[PDB]
Amino acid sequence: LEAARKRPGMYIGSTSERGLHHLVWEIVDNSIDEALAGYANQIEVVIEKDNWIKVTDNGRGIPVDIQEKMGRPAVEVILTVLHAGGKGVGSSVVNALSQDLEVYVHRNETIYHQAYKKGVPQFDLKEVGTTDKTGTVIRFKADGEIFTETTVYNYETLQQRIRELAFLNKGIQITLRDERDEENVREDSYHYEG
Ligand SMILES: C=C1CC[C@@H](O[C@H]2C[C@@](O)([C@H](C)NC(=O)c3[nH]c(C)c(Cl)c3Cl)[C@H](O)[C@@H](C)O2)[C@@H]2C=C[C@H](C)[C@H](C(=O)C3=C(O)[C@H](C(C)C)N([C@@H]4O[C@@H](C)[C@@H](OC(N)=O)[C@@H](OC(C)=O)[C@H]4OC)C3=O)[C@@H]12
Numbered sequence: 001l002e003a004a005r006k007r008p009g010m011y012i013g014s015t016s017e018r019g020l021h022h023l024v025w026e027i028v029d030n031s032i033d034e035a036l037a038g039y040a041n042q043i044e045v046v047i048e049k050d051n052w053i054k055v056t057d058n059g060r061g062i063p064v065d066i067q068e069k070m071g072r073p074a075v076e077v078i079l080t081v082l083h084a085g086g087k088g089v090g091s092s093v094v095n096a097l098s099q100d101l102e103v104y105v106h107r108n109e110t111i112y113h114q115a116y117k118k119g120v121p122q123f124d125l126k127e128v129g130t131t132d133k134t135g136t137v138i139r140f141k142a143d144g145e146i147f148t149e150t151t152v153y154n155y156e157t158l159q160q161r162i163r164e165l166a167f168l169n170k171g172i173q174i175t176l177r178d179e180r181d182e183e184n185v186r187e188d189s190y191h192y193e194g
Contacts, residue, residue: 001080001082001096001119002096002119003082004082004092004093004096004097004119005096005097005118005119005146008097008146011089011093011097012026012089012093012097015146015147015148015149016147016149016150017149017150017154017157019097019147020142020147020150020151020153021153021154021157021158021161023053023094023097023098023140023142024045024053024055024153024158024161025161026088026089026090026091026093026094027053027055027091027094027138027140028043028045028055028162028165028174029088030057030091030136031043031055031057031059031136032165032169032172034057034059034060034136035057035059035169035171035172036169039059039060040057040058040059040060040135040172041058041171041172041173042057042058042172042173042174042175043055043056043057043172043173043174043175044056044057044174044175044177045158045162045174045175045176045177046176046177046178046179047153047155047158047176047177047178047179047180048139048179048180049179049180049182050141050180051141051142051151051152051153051180052100052139052140052141053138053139053140053141053142053153054137054138054139055136055137055138055139056135056136056137056138057135057136058133058134058135059134059135059136060107060134060135061105061106061107061112061134061135061136062074062075062078062103062105062136063075063107064105064107064108064112064125073112073125075103075105075112075114075125076114076121076124076125078090078091078092079091079092079095079101079103079114079116079119080092080095080116080119080121082096091138092119094138094140095116095119095140096118096119097142097143097146097147098116098118098119098140098141098142098143099117099118099141099142099143099144099145100115100116100117100139100140100141101115101116101117101119101138101139101140101141102114102115102116102137102138102139102140103115103116103136103137103138104128104136104137104138104139105135105136105137106131106133106134106135106136106137107134109130109131109132110127110129110130110131111127111128111129111130111131112125112126112127112128113125113126113127113128114126118143155176155178155186158176159176159188162174162176162188162190163188163190165190166190166191166192167190167192170192170193170194171193172191173189173190173191174189174190174191175187175188175189175190176188176189176190
């Protein structure tokens with residue numbers, strides 16, 4: 001839990017620009033995972049005001065249904081229990097390494113939401129609207145405490161990895177939007193069929 005917070009290098013490599021951009025990598029790899037299972041074909045990575053990150057896929061939505069073994073909803077589990085769903089480190093490390101984190105699962109024509117602070121859930125999963133679409137949405141502001149030196153994302157850095165991933169995993173459409181400045185909005189959509 002706090003192991004990722006105490007040993008960040010031992011979990012994301014660097015606590016500099018490399019580690020900051022790596023937070024965006026672990027959340028996107030989660031969407032690529034869902035996409036290679038044949039459920040999502042669209043990923044969107046937005047750099048929002050005050051260097052927040054918003055990752056959106058058109059997947060089935062992280063299961064919201066209670067884990068009959070932990071009692072907590074499945075979405076709360078992957079985001080809170082370290083390394084959950086594997087052995088690529090986990091969306092939970094991106095959680096513990098963020099001062100603020102939000103989750104919006106679109107499933108059962110409804111929006112399930114929950115928010116975290118340094119991994120810690122601020123409240124229990126609540127339903128906050130109805131929806132036509134299915135998928136997951138993650139917003140995070142990397143913790144100012146851990147990422148000493150830089151918290152501002154390099155667009156060209158994100159562009160390069162997104163362009164590569166789109167090409168490796170063909171069929172997937174990954175989009176990058178820079179919204180940090182309302183007056184000049186940047187966008188690059190990557191979709192290779194071959
Ligand atoms: C916690 C969950 C619920 C969610 C599930 O992942 C989803 C993800 C999925 O929604 C899809 C890829 N996600 C997205 O679309 C997505 N989109 C975005 C923007 C994001 Cl973020 C995501 Cl995600 C996919 O569609 C569905 C089918 O699966 C996870 C996948 C596999 C596991 C079976 C996992 C689970 O039930 C686990 C458990 O019961 C235990 C927990 C309760 C402790 N656990 C373990 O958690 C640790 C101790 C481990 O530790 C490691 N490996 O270091 C093991 O533990 C062990 C003992 O090895 C690991 O395996 C047992 C688990 O991983 C599952």
